[PDB]
Every structure is written in structure tokens, then in C-alpha cells.
Design an enzyme around this catalytic site. Structure first.
Site, short mmCIF file in Angstrom:
data_model
loop_
_atom_site.label_atom_id
_atom_site.label_comp_id
_atom_site.label_asym_id
_atom_site.label_seq_id
_atom_site.Cartn_x
_atom_site.Cartn_y
_atom_site.Cartn_z
N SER B 366 2.18 48.75 65.13
CA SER B 366 1.49 49.84 64.85
C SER B 366 0.60 49.56 65.69
O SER B 366 -0.67 49.00 65.34
N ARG B 367 -0.21 51.21 66.52
CA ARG B 367 -0.75 50.70 67.34
C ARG B 367 -2.13 52.04 66.76
O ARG B 367 -3.38 51.37 67.27
N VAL B 368 -2.24 52.54 66.35
CA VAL B 368 -2.64 52.82 64.83
C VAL B 368 -3.26 52.44 63.53
O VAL B 368 -4.34 52.31 63.08
N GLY B 369 -2.12 51.68 63.23
CA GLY B 369 -2.29 50.70 62.01
C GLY B 369 -3.37 51.05 60.90
O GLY B 369 -3.56 51.73 60.28
#
Lengths: 50, 499, 62, 56, 470
Positions: B366-369
Site C-alpha cells: 500500500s503506497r499510502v500505507g
């Protein structure tokens, strides 16, 4: 309740097929002629309002 | 009776049928009527046939206007009058669709009354601008502990649930929806995520089961199910996510948050393939139309967390992509992966080995993570990421005389893997995710026998609930884990470990 | 107008055949009868037990 | 209540531990404990005791 | 007859274009009949091309046709005959017999196109069909009203599997069944016709609990397409109109895929991936949605599928793979091992497998079975190279149990009294759960692996242990 709901659905589709019998009655009758006159003049009035 | 009410309603239609522009089908084959007329028609506009068929008008050609019929060809025949409704596709939008399974048009296929919703707004509208967004920071918690920790999800973002066919892909998704009941009960309307499940190509029996399960878990009252079933026509399927998105816009615009799960865009793709081929537009790479990238992208950037001037709201999304052989190399997966911001890739082997969730931790990102991660859970599961990394390397060390460190890792790791199992269709509360992972981090669980992990978990939760639900509620409400709480937790775990 | 005709014809001519309660009984599940008080759950009954327990366990194992 | 009974049961298990011949006392205690926990599930398995002649 | 008279203009294969007159208006999905010395050729109207010139698809062959030939219009989708007199009668695509028991029809005919029941119509069921085939019952629990799917490679005794199912389930079953054959070979047909006369499911006197619809691949692709539609409607008539539950059986639906692919191409609708029609998904959807558990009835389809070159990544099997409720994959290796059925049970997944749904004991047992067999497979590489004995004693016991279990999957079949000579075994569901549970507990690890081979239940396993002992 289940048979009651089923019976309501069944009654409406039975009565629908009775409507088909009434549809055949309307399109036979010279109500077909007299309502065509009504529709004709109604279109005359309506379309003139355009 | 009821019949009388219908007849009264029929009496209530008599409207002047002065159809400014009519059409006549010249030839109808393949659901591609070519109509003579429709001079001033808008593109994609809704048209009503004599057959009553609904259509969109993808081709506006000079000599003929090539309607694409939404309806079946069964009643359609050449010469058919084509009234020009004069309205591009619009669907009711509003909170009226909560607990309502509707088709794309808006007809309630569950028949939970004619849909009364705030407005009907058009299906396609362009995605929010740069300045109309503000960065994500608000978590969303799916109840799936692994999802919440390994790949923490937020609001107004896209992130895949890409995995192999019939691994209960829908089951993984459904679990998130169920946990949203807890938050839904909660007052804050960012905590009220009004979920939209978009069942694409899914047979009506399957969706009936889905509906029934949702009803069992009383989830139909924040849930909305946009349904384009297996039977439902390829135009309906094509416009189905777009239509769904508009429903989401009312919530988003109202500043609320909501989650739209497009399941599966792979079947959306096939419908577009069918459409493109029927309009004889060349089929792109892997015989999936060339503008499939464009199609998916147009949809997928509508998932967005708006700015605070745009009343801090969102339409979180979680697209589901079906990987035929597990090939993320496949053209539609590769494209979608590029478009989206994260992917979760469930591993078939893990599924087979009964590890449900079956998540492939490496192939999930997840890039937002961690920006959208609960602080408490962040503290007690940074460690978890590193431990699992070692565990992956020491997976192959399961083939034995091993370094003591390696053997310890193997034990700690195995217990963790079992801990992250969560039986399908049973979400968990965040206030109960955090203590358990803390125990594992402190290696308390390592000692506990693998079989007794399960017994330990439920017992530990009750033990915690009895001993200190003051702590649990405090942890829950603070949302952070203070040194004092972590101290108490280590102690509490020790006490539980003793029993 | 046909609108009026349709309205008129359908409403006026409406045919409802009623279905017997007996037919309904077939099509619905019929009521199940009272469960009855029955014997209640009872333990330690009879002085057979009393003599047995006293005598059998008049001692612990050394 | 039942928690009184069971607290005394497990206290008696570890007392029966210290002696012998009471190794089936604990099994009798186990049987009643079972039935107490069963009765709670019975009492919790109490579906509505009257017809819903309000709605239905 | 009807003013709707068209004169053929182009015979371009199965595609035959007709030129109905300007006054007359045909409609898509109609059925045209052309009187011919080869019965009445049926053409299904599939496009209008303008000035009442349609492009229609032939069902029957197109030899000897003369362009200019007067064409009557039936006026709508092909009309089969329906009744309870359809039972034990072979019905060809246009409805005409092959059983040659004269006029099939009760007092009714029906069109073969019909719509899939709406969401409102759908009625869910968790009822469990029992195959009576122990391995199938335990490791792939079947469901009544389901959409069972016999996925497999080349002719895995596909017919044989169906025959066993009919032998067990059908006779037990009280409803009707419909055996529908799509392009099936006439040798297989003759065997099936004979076989179901023998099993008496085609009861020569009295009612038959099966109906037959035999399609031959010889018949043009067009007929191959609408044999499926025909069968589907017969099941609907049973489900709906007769109200009874049914057990639909279709064979082989890849032949349905191939047929559809061909006439797509012929229709000019450029065939999509791996030459498979762009309308494949929606065509599948219409068939599949039509088969369901309604409130009118419940129908359990068992549909054979041929997976070309055992590649299920191929779009056509894969597309079907989604739509079916209860998949099973028949594997050659297991067949070669002699096990009948040939299903690889680690390659079989039925929707019903949920723990409480199949019952906690059943579930727990099934988790254990899956592990035990899986252990044998995983360990097979180690046993193979490193050697059998280098493995743990615990592992070896699991392997020994797996070998016993593996050959306890072997159920000699009644319909393999001609393929093996050894009679069937009809093992009750409860009996299977119990007997498999026992094996796992290791209670019959004193019974040889081969004393489970080609014998039934625990009683039989013991009996063959004694038999071998003697």
C-alpha cells in the site's frame, strides 16, 4: 404469510390474463372507432397547442 | 386491490407524444441498430425504442446513428420507432439506496420499493482536480488484522485486491464490509463508510446469497449493491461502475466517506471487449480493447479524498481484479497495477493451505500505507513487518539443524502466521488487534504451543476483557499506545501467559 | 380515449376467484401442538444412590 | 451462583490432588459443572416465548 | 401459408439470407420453416439487413438449396413439444423424435428462448445432494439445485462419470432428469440409449425418470447451438410447469462453446480470444442463469466440460469455471493409478465446504483428509529422490494412511461392471464420514492399502482384508 404473498402475486397475474381478454374486447369493439375519433380530436387539440 | 392502484397509475399517463425527433431502425443486427433520424441527439443519450429497449448512442455517424441496445434484440426488428428520450444516462443518487440492491438503471432488483433517492445524476462525470483533493491521513480499518497492519488502508484511495479466481475473492472483500458495521454504528460520518459493492457479471443466485449473508449480518443499511449480474447486458456492465461512482459522489459531495468495491473489473473488461468488437473497433493487446486503459483510468480517478474546502470527504475504492492463472503480467492486470496506488495479491498456495486470509505479504503493498494506520497498531506492528521478512527467508529453513537464531525465528514466525489467520466472515475489533500483536512482538506467543495459539487468542481477549476492558477502551479511544499502556500490556500478557 | 377504456374495462370487469382455507392449509405449514409439561430433570433420586455413595466411598485410597 | 459451585469445584480438584480415592469426586463435579454450563446455554437458547402477533 | 414469404438469395453456408417482402416484417430470434424433401429446414432469424432481407442461420443441412425458395415463418423462437410425455423420449433439436415413439408433446409446445429468472425470482438453498460416491461426497459435497461441473481434459470417461451419477443419484432421485447431449458421438449415444434402457431409467413401459435430448456433432453448428436451448427449456418446463425438481445433465459444453464460436464467425461477429466468440460470456450467462433454484422448482445441472489440452487458463473453460457452482477436475494420473473416479481431490472444490454448513465434524475430517493426501504428495518428491525411509516415522505413518486413503477413494463402479467388471458401491453420506474418520484415527492401519483398493466402506475394507488374508 408465505402463501398469502404468493397468492397475491398469483391473483395479479391471473387478473392480468383477464385484462388480456379485455384488451381483445376493446380492439374488436367500434369503441375502437369511437375512441379513435376521441384520440384524433385530442391530437388535433394537443398538437395545435404546439 | 393493488391492481386498482396500478390502473389508477396507468390512467395517470396520457402525456402528449409529440416526439420532436423519432427514428426508424434501418437494420438491426447484433444489437447494433442503425437508425435513420435522431438529428439533434446528444452523444451517449438515452433512447427508447418501440420495443421499449433502452440504448446509448456510441456511434454518431453521418448517415446512421448507431445505437447500442441495452435491451435484448428479441423484440427488436427493423423499422422500429426510436423515440429520443433526450437525456444522457442518469441514475438516482442519494442515501435512498442504502440497503437497496438496484440494477444500473436504478430499478430495485430486490424490489425493496421504487428507489427514492435525492436526485438522479448522470453516470459519467470527470474526476476531481489537483486542488480539489487533500492528502489521505484518515485510516479505514477493515477488521482484517493483517490488512490493517501489513497494508494499512485509508480513505479516497485505490488499492487492488488482485487474486485468483473463486478463492472467495468476494469473501475477502465482504469481510471489510462487515467490519464497517462497527464504524457505521459510530457517529462520525467519516466513520460512516457507506459501502457500495458492485457485483459485476455475478450470477443472481450468487448475489442472492451475498444479499442474504449481508441481511444475516444486518449490513444492508449502509451497504448499497449495484448489480450487473451475469445476464445483465454488456452496456449495463460497461456503464455499471460509472453509474455506481455517481451514487458515491452524493456521499462524497456531502463530505462523508464511503467505500466502493468494484468486483471484478476483469468482467467489465470482457463487456467492453464485446462492445468494441460489435462496433468493429480493433481489439487491443490480449484482444481486450485498446482504450481499456482509458476506461479503467476514467473510473479509477473518481476514487478520491476531496480537499477540506471540498468538505473533506471521499470515495475510497478497492478494485478486485481476477488473475486467470495468477498472471499479474496479464495485460489488464499490468495496466491496472500501474493505474492504482497499491495492490494486495492473495496467494493461492496459502489459500490451499487453509491460511485464510491468504494474502501474499510480499506482493501486497500500500503506497499510502502507514500514513493511514492507527498509531497504536503502527507501534506494535512495525516489528511485525521485520519479523515476517526474516520469517520469509527462514521459510526455506523449514527443510533440521539450524542456527539457534534461525530456529527461534522459525518458531516465532510460525506462531505469527497462525495469529494472522482470521476465520472467514468474522471481523475483529482494532482494540483487540493491538494487544495480540504486542504479545507476539514481545515473543510471549512464541512460547505458547501452536495448537494452543487459537485457544490462547480467544481466551486472551476474554481475559483482557475481564481484567482490563478499561485498558482496551482506553487503547481504543486514545488510538495510540503510550509507554504506560505498553508496559501494562507486557505485564498483562505475562499474567495471561502464566495461564 | 383508450386510456379511459383500459381503466374502465379492467376495473369494472375485475375477476377475483377466492381460494379455500383448506387449499391454504396445504400450502402453509399447519400449527404444531403444545409441548406438554412432561417429567422435569431430576437427579439423586432413590435411596439406592444414598446407600451406594456412603458405602462405596466410606474411605479414600491410602 | 454457578460460579460459586465451579470455584469450589476446582478448589476441590486441587484438594483431591492432595488425597486419592477422590479421583472420581472431581469427575462427578465435572459432570455437574458441565450441566451448569449446559443449562446456561439452554437458558441462552431461549428463543422468544410468545408469538409476534404484533407485526405478523 | 403466412404472407411472410421470403425467397432465398444467398446460400453462403449455414448463413442463408432470405428476402421477405416489404409489407411483411420478421423479427430477431424467429424461426423460419422451409418445406424441403429433407423435412422442414429451420432457419433462425439473427439479423435484419434492410428491405426485409434477413440473415438467418440454418439448423439442418444446406445441400441442394435453390436461391429463390419460398420461406414460411413459424413466427418466433423454435417451438419444441413439452409435456410429461417427453419423459423417455429422444427429442431432436426441432423437437422431432429419435426414439420413434410417435408424437412427442402432451398438449403443449413451448418456445426454446426464455429469459433467466430475475433476482426477485431467485430462491437460495443450502440443500445437499448426495452422490453416493464416497470420495465425491466427502471432499466435494454436492448441493441440490446446484450447478455441478465435471471439468476435465479429453474424454475422461466423461460419459462414464455421468452414467455412474445417473445410476446412483437418478434412481434414488424422485424428480425427473434430463440428459442433454451436445454434439455427442453416436456410438456413445447408442450406448447411453441402451444403458438407460438397461438401468430402466428409460422405463419402456411406464414413465421414465429421465428424458433424452441427443445431439450429434454431425448436425450443423447451428443445430449444435440450439440443442442446448432446447434442453434448457425442457428442464424449465419440468422445474416450473411440472413443479418438480429435476437433475439436468448436459454434455459436453465445450462443444457448445465450439459451436457458438463457429456461428459467431459465420455471423460476421469477429471471434474474440482464442477464436472464441465475443458474446461467449453473455451466452454462458443466459444458459447458466436459466439453470437455477427458483421457487417453482430446483434443478441440479451436471454439465460436462472438455478443457482443451488440459489448459484451463484457456478463456473458454476459464469463463465457464466462474459460472458453475460445484467444480470437479478429473485427472489422468489418478485414472492411471486405477482409481475410479479419476478426480484429483486436491483439484476439486465445491461451494459447500463451509465448516458449519457441511458440519463441523465433516469439515474437520475433510481438513484432515486434505492434509493427509497433501502430505503424501508433498513428501512424494522426498520419497522419490532422498528415499522413503529417510523421512520421519510420523511422516511415514501419514504416508501409509494416505496410501490406504488413496485406495479407499477407489470405489468400484456399477457402470464399470463393463469397464472393470467389479460392481458399484453406494455408500451413505454418514457412513462415508465415519469410515474416513476411522482411517484418519489410524484404527485401520492394520488393514492393507490394497485392502482398501477397489472396495467400498469400512465393512468391505475389513472383508477384503480378511479375503486377502485367506
Amino acid at each position: 404469510v408465505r402463501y398469502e404473498a404468493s397468492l397475491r402475486q398469483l391473483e395479479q397475474r391471473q387478473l392480468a390474463k383477464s385484462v388480456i381478454s379485455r384488451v381483445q374486447s376493446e380492439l374488436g369493439n367500434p369503441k375502437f372507432q369511437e375512441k379513435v375519433l376521441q384520440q384524433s380530436i385530442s391530437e388535433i387539440e394537443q398538437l395545435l397547442s404546439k | 386491490e393493488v391492481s386498482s392502484i396500478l390502473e389508477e397509475r396507468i390512467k395517470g399517463v396520457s402525456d402528449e407524444a409529440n416526439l420532436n425527433e423519432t427514428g426508424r431502425v434501418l437494420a438491426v443486427g447484433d444489437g447494433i441498430a442503425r437508425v435513420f433520424g435522431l438529428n439533434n441527439i446528444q452523444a451517449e443519450e438515452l433512447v427508447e425504442f418501440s420495443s421499449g429497449v433502452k440504448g446509448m448512442a456510441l456511434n454518431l455517424e453521418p448517415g446512421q446513428v448507431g445505437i447500442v441496445l441495452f435491451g435484448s434484440d428479441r423484440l427488436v426488428k427493423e423499422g422500429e420507432l426510436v423515440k429520443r428520450t433526450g437525456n444522457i444516462v442518469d441514475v438516482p443518487v442519494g442515501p435512498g439506496l442504502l440497503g437497496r440492491v438496484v440494477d444500473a438503471l436504478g430499478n430495485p432488483i430486490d424490489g425493496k420499493g421504487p428507489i427514492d433517492a435525492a436526485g438522479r445524476s448522470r453516470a459519467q462525470v470527470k474526476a476531481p482536480g489537483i486542488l480539489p483533493r487533500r492528502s489521505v491521513h484518515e485510516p479505514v480499518q477493515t477488521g482484517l488484522k493483517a490488512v490493517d497492519a501489513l497494508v494499512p488502508i485509508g480513505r479516497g484511495q485505490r488499492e487492488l485486491i488482485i487474486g485468483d479466481r473463486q478463492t472467495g475473492k468476494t469473501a475477502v472483500a465482504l469481510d471489510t464490509i462487515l467490519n464497517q458495521k462497527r464504524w457505521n454504528n459510530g457517529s462520525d460520518e467519516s466513520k460512516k463508510l457507506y459501502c457500495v459493492y458492485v457485483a459485476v457479471g455475478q450470477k443472481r443466485s450468487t448475489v442472492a446469497q451475498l444479499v442474504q449473508t449481508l441481511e444475516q449480518h444486518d449490513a444492508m443499511k449502509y451497504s448499497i449493491i449495484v448489480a450487473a449480474t451475469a445476464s445483465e447486458a454488456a452496456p449495463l456492465q460497461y456503464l455499471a461502475p460509472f453509474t455506481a461512482a455517481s451514487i458515491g459522489e452524493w456521499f462524497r459531495d456531502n463530505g462523508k466517506h464511503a467505500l466502493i468495491v468494484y468486483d471484478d473489473l476483469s468482467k467489465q473488461a470482457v463487456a467492453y471487449r464485446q462492445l468494441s468488437l460489435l462496433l468493429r473497433r480493433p481489439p487491443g493487446r490480449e484482444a481486450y480493447p485498446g482504450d481499456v486503459f482509458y476506461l479503467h483510468s476514467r473510473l479509477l480517478e473518481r476514487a478520491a479524498k476531496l480537499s477540506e474546502k471540498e468538505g473533506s470527504g471521499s470515495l475510497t475504492a478497492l478494485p478486485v481484479i481476477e488473475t486467470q492463472g495468477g498472471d499479474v503480467s496479464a495485460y489488464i492486470p499490468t495496466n491496472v497495477i500501474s493505474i492504482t496506488d497499491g495492490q494486495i495479491f492473495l496467494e493461492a498456495e496459502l489459500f490451499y493451505k487453509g491460511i485464510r486470509p491468504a494474502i501474499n505479504v510480499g506482493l501486497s503493498v500500500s503506497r499510502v500505507g502507514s500514513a493511514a494506520q492507527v498509531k497504536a497498531l503502527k507501534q506494535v506492528a512495525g516489528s511485525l513487518k521485520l519479523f515476517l521478512a526474516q520469517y520469509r527467508e527462514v521459510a526455506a529453513f523449514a527443510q533440521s539443524d539450524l542456527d539457534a537464531s534461525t530456529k527461534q525465528t522459525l518458531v516465532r514466525g510460525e506462531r505469527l502466521t497462525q495469529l494472522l489467520k482470521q476465520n472467514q466472515y468474522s471481523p475483529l475489533a482494532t482494540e483487540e488487534q493491538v494487544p495480540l500483536i504486542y504479545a507476539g512482538v514481545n515473543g510471549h506467543l512464541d512460547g505458547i504451543e501452536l495448537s494452543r495459539i487459537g485457544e490462547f487468542e480467544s481466551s486472551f481477549l476474554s481475559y483482557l476483557k475481564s481484567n482490563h476492558n478499561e485498558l482496551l477502551t482506553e487503547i481504543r479511544e486514545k488510538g495510540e499506545l503510550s509507554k504506560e499502556l505498553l508496559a501494562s500490556l507486557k505485564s498483562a500478557t505475562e499474567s495471561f501467559v502464566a495461564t | 380515449n383508450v386510456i379511459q377504456d383500459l381503466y374502465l374495462r379492467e376495473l369494472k370487469d375485475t375477476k377475483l376467484a377466492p381460494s379455500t382455507l383448506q387449499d391454504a392449509e396445504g400450502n402453509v405449514k399447519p400449527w404444531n401442538p403444545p409441548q406438554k409439561p412432561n417429567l422435569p430433570e431430576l437427579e439423586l433420586q432413590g435411596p439406592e444412590a444414598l446407600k451406594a455413595y456412603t458405602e462405596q466411598n466410606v474411605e479414600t485410597a491410602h | 451462583a454457578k460460579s460459586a459451585a465451579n470455584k469450589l469445584d476446582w478448589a476441590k480438584v486441587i484438594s483431591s490432588l492432595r488425597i486419592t480415592g477422590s479421583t472420581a469426586t472431581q469427575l462427578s463435579s465435572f459432570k455437574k459443572r458441565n450441566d451448569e454450563a449446559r443449562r446456561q446455554l439452554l437458558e441462552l437458547q431461549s428463543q422468544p416465548t410468545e408469538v409476534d402477533f404484533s407485526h405478523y | 401459408s403466412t404472407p411472410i414469404t421470403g425467397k432465398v438469395t444467398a446460400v453462403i453456408g449455414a448463413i442463408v439470407d432470405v428476402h421477405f417482402e416489404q409489407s411483411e416484417l420478421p423479427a430477431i430470434l424467429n424461426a423460419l420453416e422451409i418445406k424441403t424433401p429433407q423435412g422442414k429446414l429451420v432457419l433462425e432469424v439473427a439479423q435484419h439487413l434492410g428491405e426485409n432481407t434477413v440473415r438467418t442461420i440454418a439448423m439442418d443441412g444446406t445441400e441442394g438449396l435453390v436461391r429463390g425458395e419460398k420461406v414460411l415463418d413459424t413466427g418466433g423462437p423454435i417451438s419444441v413439444p413439452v409435456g410429461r410425455e417427453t419423459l423417455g423420449r429422444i427429442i431432436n433439436v426441432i423437437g422431432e423424435p429419435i426414439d420413434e415413439r410417435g408424437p412427442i408433446k402432451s398438449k403443449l409446445r413451448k418456445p426454446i428462448h426464455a429469459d433467466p429468472p430475475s433476482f426477485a425470482e431467485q430462491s437460495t438453498s443450502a440443500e445437499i445432494l448426495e452422490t453416493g460416491i464416497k470420495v465425491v461426497d466427502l471432499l466435494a459435497p454436492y448441493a441440490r439445485g446446484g450447478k455441478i461441473g465435471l471439468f476435465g481434459g479429453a474424454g475422461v470417461g466423461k460419459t462414464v462419470f455421468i452414467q455412474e451419477l445417473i445410476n446412483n443419484i437418478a434412481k434414488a432421485h424422485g424428480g425427473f432428469s434430463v440428459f442433454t447431449g451436445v454434439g455427442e458421438r453416436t456410438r456413445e449415444g447408442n450406448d447411453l440409449y441402451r444403458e438407460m434402457k438397461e438401468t430402466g431409467v428409460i422405463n419402456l413401459e411406464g414413465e421414465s425418470k429421465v428424458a433424452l435430448v441427443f445431439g450429434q456433432m454431425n448436425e450443423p453448428p447451428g443445430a449444435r447451438a440450439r440443442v442446448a436451448l432446447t434442453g434448457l427449456t425442457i428442464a424449465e418446463y419440468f422445474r416450473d410447469e411440472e413443479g418438480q425438481d429435476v437433475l439436468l445433465f448436459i454434455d459436453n459444453i465445450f462443444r457448445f462453446t465450439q459451436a457458438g464460436s463457429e456461428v459467431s464467425a459465420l455471423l460476421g461477429r469477429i471471434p474474440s480470444a482464442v477464436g472464441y466468440q465475443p458474446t461467449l460470456a453473455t451466452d454462458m450467462g443466459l444458459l447458466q442463469e436459466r439453470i437455477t433454484t427458483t421457487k417453482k422448482g430446483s434443478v441440479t445441472s451436471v454439465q460436462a466440460v472438455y478443457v482443451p489440452a488440459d489448459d484451463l487458463t484457456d478463456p473458454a473453460p476459464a469463463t465457464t469455471f466462474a459460472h458453475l457452482d460445484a467444480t470437479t477436475v478429473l485427472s489422468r494420473g489418478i485414472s492411471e493409478l486405477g482409481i475410479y473416479p479419476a478426480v484429483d481431490p486436491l483439484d476439486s472444490k465445491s461451494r459447500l465446504l463451509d465448516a458449519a454448513v457441511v458440519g463441523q465434524e465433516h469439515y474437520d475430517v475433510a481438513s484432515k483428509v486434505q492434509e493427509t493426501l497433501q502430505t503424501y504428495k508433498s513428501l512424494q518428491d522426498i520419497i522419490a529422490i532422498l528415499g522413503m525411509d529417510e523421512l520421519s516415522e510420523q511422516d511415514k505413518l501419514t504416508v501409509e494412511r494416505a496410501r490406504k486413503i488413496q485406495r479407499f477413494l477407489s470405489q468400484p463402479f456399477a457402470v464399470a461392471e463393463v469397464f472393470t467388471g467389479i460392481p458399484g458401491k453406494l455408500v451413505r453420506l454418514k457412513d462415508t464420514v465415519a469410515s474416513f474418520k476411522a482411517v484418519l484415527e489410524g484404527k485401520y492401519d492394520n488393514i492393507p492399502e490394497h485392502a482398501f483398493y477397489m472396495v467400498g466402506g469400512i465393512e468391505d475394507v475389513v472383508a477384503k482384508a480378511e479375503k486377502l488374508a485367506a
